[PDB]
Amino acid sequence: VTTLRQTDPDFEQKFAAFLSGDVDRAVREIVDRVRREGDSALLDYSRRFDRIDLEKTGIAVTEAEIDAAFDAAPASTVEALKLARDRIEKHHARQLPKDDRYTDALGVELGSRWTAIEAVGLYVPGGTASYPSSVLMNAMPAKVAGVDRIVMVVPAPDGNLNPLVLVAARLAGVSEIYRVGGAQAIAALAYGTETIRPVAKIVGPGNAYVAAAKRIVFGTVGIDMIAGPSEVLIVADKDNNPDWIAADLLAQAEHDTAAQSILMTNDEAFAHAVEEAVERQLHTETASASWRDFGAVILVKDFEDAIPLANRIAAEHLEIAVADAEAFVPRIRNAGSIFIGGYTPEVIGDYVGGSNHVLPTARSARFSSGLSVLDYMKRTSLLKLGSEQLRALGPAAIEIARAEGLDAHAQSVAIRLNLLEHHHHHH
Amino acid sequence: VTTLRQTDPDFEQKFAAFLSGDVDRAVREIVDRVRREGDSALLDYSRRFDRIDLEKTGIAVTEAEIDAAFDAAPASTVEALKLARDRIEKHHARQLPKDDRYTDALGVELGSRWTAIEAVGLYVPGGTASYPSSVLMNAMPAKVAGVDRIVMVVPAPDGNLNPLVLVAARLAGVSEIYRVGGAQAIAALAYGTETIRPVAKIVGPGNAYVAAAKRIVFGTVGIDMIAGPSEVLIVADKDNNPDWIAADLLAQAEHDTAAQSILMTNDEAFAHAVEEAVERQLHTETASASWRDFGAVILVKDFEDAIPLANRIAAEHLEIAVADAEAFVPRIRNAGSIFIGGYTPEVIGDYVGGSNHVLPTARSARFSSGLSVLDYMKRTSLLKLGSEQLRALGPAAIEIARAEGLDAHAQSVAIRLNLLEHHHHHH
Ligand SMILES: [Zn+2]
Ligand SMILES: [Zn+2]
Ligand SMILES: [Zn+2]
Ligand SMILES: [Zn+2]
Numbered sequence: 001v002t003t004l005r006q007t008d009p010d011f012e013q014k015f016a017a018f019l020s021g022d023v024d025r026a027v028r029e030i031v032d033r034v035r036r037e038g039d040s041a042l043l044d045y046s047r048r049f050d051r052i053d054l055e056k057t058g059i060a061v062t063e064a065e066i067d068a069a070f071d072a073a074p075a076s077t078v079e080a081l082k083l084a085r086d087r088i089e090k091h092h093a094r095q096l097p098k099d100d101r102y103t104d105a106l107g108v109e110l111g112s113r114w115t116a117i118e119a120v121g122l123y124v125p126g127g128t129a130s131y132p133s134s135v136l137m138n139a140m141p142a143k144v145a146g147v148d149r150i151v152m153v154v155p156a157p158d159g160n161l162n163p164l165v166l167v168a169a170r171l172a173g174v175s176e177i178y179r180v181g182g183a184q185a186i187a188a189l190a191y192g193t194e195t196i197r198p199v200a201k202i203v204g205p206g207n208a209y210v211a212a213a214k215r216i217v218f219g220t221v222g223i224d225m226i227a228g229p230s231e232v233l234i235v236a237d238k239d240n241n242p243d244w245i246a247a248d249l250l251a252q253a254e255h256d257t258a259a260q261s262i263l264m265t266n267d268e269a270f271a272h273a274v275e276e277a278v279e280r281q282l283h284t285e286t287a288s289a290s291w292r293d294f295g296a297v298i299l300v301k302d303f304e305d306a307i308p309l310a311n312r313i314a315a316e317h318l319e320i321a322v323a324d325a326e327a328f329v330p331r332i333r334n335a336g337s338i339f340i341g342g343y344t345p346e347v348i349g350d351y352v353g354g355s356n357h358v359l360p361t362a363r364s365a366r367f368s369s370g371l372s373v374l375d376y377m378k379r380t381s382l383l384k385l386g387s388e389q390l391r392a393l394g395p396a397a398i399e400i401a402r403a404e405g406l407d408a409h410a411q412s413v414a415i416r417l418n419l420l421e422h423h424h425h426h427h
Numbered sequence: 428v429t430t431l432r433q434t435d436p437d438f439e440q441k442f443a444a445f446l447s448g449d450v451d452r453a454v455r456e457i458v459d460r461v462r463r464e465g466d467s468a469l470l471d472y473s474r475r476f477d478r479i480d481l482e483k484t485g486i487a488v489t490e491a492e493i494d495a496a497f498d499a500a501p502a503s504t505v506e507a508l509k510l511a512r513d514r515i516e517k518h519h520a521r522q523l524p525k526d527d528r529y530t531d532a533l534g535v536e537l538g539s540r541w542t543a544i545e546a547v548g549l550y551v552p553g554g555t556a557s558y559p560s561s562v563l564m565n566a567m568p569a570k571v572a573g574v575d576r577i578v579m580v581v582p583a584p585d586g587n588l589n590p591l592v593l594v595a596a597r598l599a600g601v602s603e604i605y606r607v608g609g610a611q612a613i614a615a616l617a618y619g620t621e622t623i624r625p626v627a628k629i630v631g632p633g634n635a636y637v638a639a640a641k642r643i644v645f646g647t648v649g650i651d652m653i654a655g656p657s658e659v660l661i662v663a664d665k666d667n668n669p670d671w672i673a674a675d676l677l678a679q680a681e682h683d684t685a686a687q688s689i690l691m692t693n694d695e696a697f698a699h700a701v702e703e704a705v706e707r708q709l710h711t712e713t714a715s716a717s718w719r720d721f722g723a724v725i726l727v728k729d730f731e732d733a734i735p736l737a738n739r740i741a742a743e744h745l746e747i748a749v750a751d752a753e754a755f756v757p758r759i760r761n762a763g764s765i766f767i768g769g770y771t772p773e774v775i776g777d778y779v780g781g782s783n784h785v786l787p788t789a790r791s792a793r794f795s796s797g798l799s800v801l802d803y804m805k806r807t808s809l810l811k812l813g814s815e816q817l818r819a820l821g822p823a824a825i826e827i828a829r830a831e832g833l834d835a836h837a838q839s840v841a842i843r844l845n846l847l848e849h850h851h852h853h854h
Contacts, residue, residue: 079823081827215643343813343816344811352826353822363645381765382765385771387770408674412772
């Protein structure tokens, strides 16, 4: 496994290189066609890519089909999904924003008010990449935020849908479910078709076609972020169970073939002990291809050294397993989620922690946060000036407007001050 | 001026049509070249588009050049910019997020922590579109949020820079200023060059080239939103000064040739009185082309009717001038900023209100908010489970992981529970 040593005269060059790292035309055409033509183009693309005939199966999934999904599900799985839904809901409810209206010293009334986005669409991959936990994580915050209409699009290749996805959808307050995917589904959500009324925002990672479609429609609808390769950074000292740390690195690896698992430690023997555990557990596929191709160990002399390196890696998931861990939490500023101690494997956050696992990937923790209720809401600014306030702030506005050559802007203030001033000749 | 009447059997069709409504290849190449080549490609593109030779003028603006800018500025303009900076700062400080760490009923420790984005870049148009108010509005929130490095890129066509932009930059805590623009500047900020170290997020509306460049780099850096045509919606009854309302419609029009100003009223005579005022003031250019080409009046019978229409328009700027205005504020959920009463022209919000004027355009108020300190910060989730908590939540996680075919994920929990369980045979 790749191993970098901070003291190496070439460490910086190798570390920076380690951190570094089309379908546009086809997608541009698919998006434009769905926009201009609607349902018929949706059915057309679904045939080409999902080998399904929506004319016969229908575009929308029925409540009856969702009921059948519930009955087919093992009781313990439905129960587990409900516990996860309940934990996620309670956690997100705490993050609801509070409005703020106040009067400043000049008597100006300033306000901040939050409302939910009216309709939101959740993109959920189809087939073997179709996970019910993803559905709860993406839909529950919208439900908590108060979104009136929650739509889910999920492709059904060869007509197959994971029934657990339908089970999760209901548990999380999803209102409409449509059997479509790819750039065509993204276009339908953004522009609308005869059957699918448009939404105001689309969330949910997808493949290259979905990603390209989202870059196009951004502006017409809001979008969460572009899906990028996932990574876990584990910062651990020798006082850990090597098998446990290995299991955590492998859990992240099975996720995707390009997923990356990094161990940052100050004890080489421990790093060796973790690599041996990774090897044994690897027997007793995607994780194999993932750990070998992208796995890595970074050796530092102490954890003060690990701080700047961890900040540059800016991992989606950061497991901190060192003595006095709570002390490093505030020092490591770039991380989507931080899991503390030996009993908190990243996996728990994917399912039952309650904290949203849909986190920023590919160094995006440098500028973004994981999904929260805020992503499903928006703030409106409120401002009210009375005559006194306009008299006090208007001149400054006029000065700036005129300095900017914006005479109409200056006049909208001057036309008011010119009349008002006749009542202020005393001062 | 275009006039729609809600009762018209064809109103809905006309209103919906009223609401509706390339360089990609060239930009894709410019962005890729700057990424691969650095400074030399920056200088190359700057010559082609700004007719400037950065080899002689230099890429970075010097402190000395900024000092000269201050001296050349009229005292009242510097003072006005400072009052605006102070109002914006005090307002934004109130919006700083608070961290939240707590322990739930199961003893799970959950946390929410906020940090500032380390480096941010502000794109400011050059030439006659170069406004100092824009600089304060875009930079001040980053300064309040605690951004360590604030960078501004501003093209200097034919070597000319608005000195007031340099004055504002300093007042707002901008650290570095570079004389570059377009897709080349966006590429330099996102990928970095020898002279310009990369930033984590880029904010600031630009032209079609800037917009295309931002769509490309999104993911590598965060981006605010894509600039779209601006619009003001004024909902007013007859108890207003027609000249004042006209001035407000014209102020928004001079902004851009595609800017849109809409009057929504329940009194046709008043609408006529406003149109006549717009005509007289139009004499005593861009505003002219803007009001005629995109201006519009929407007649309703009462303001209850105006609510759903205003929500569909979802204007960047909404001026509410009706009796009992405070009553409609909560009913109109989609609006970037709401200005209340006759003494609050939208213009005040652009400069001295304190509330950020960089608001969502082209119906984006349906899903986004105007710039705030939150846009310059990010949240990190914290999670800590002890043995008891993992014992209580682990089984559910395993159940879901296995139902999803994610065995490595299930094992990272099972490997811990398998050892831990020997201490829990009593229950
Ligand atoms: Zn050290
Ligand atoms: Zn995971
Ligand atoms: Zn009515
Ligand atoms: Zn304005």
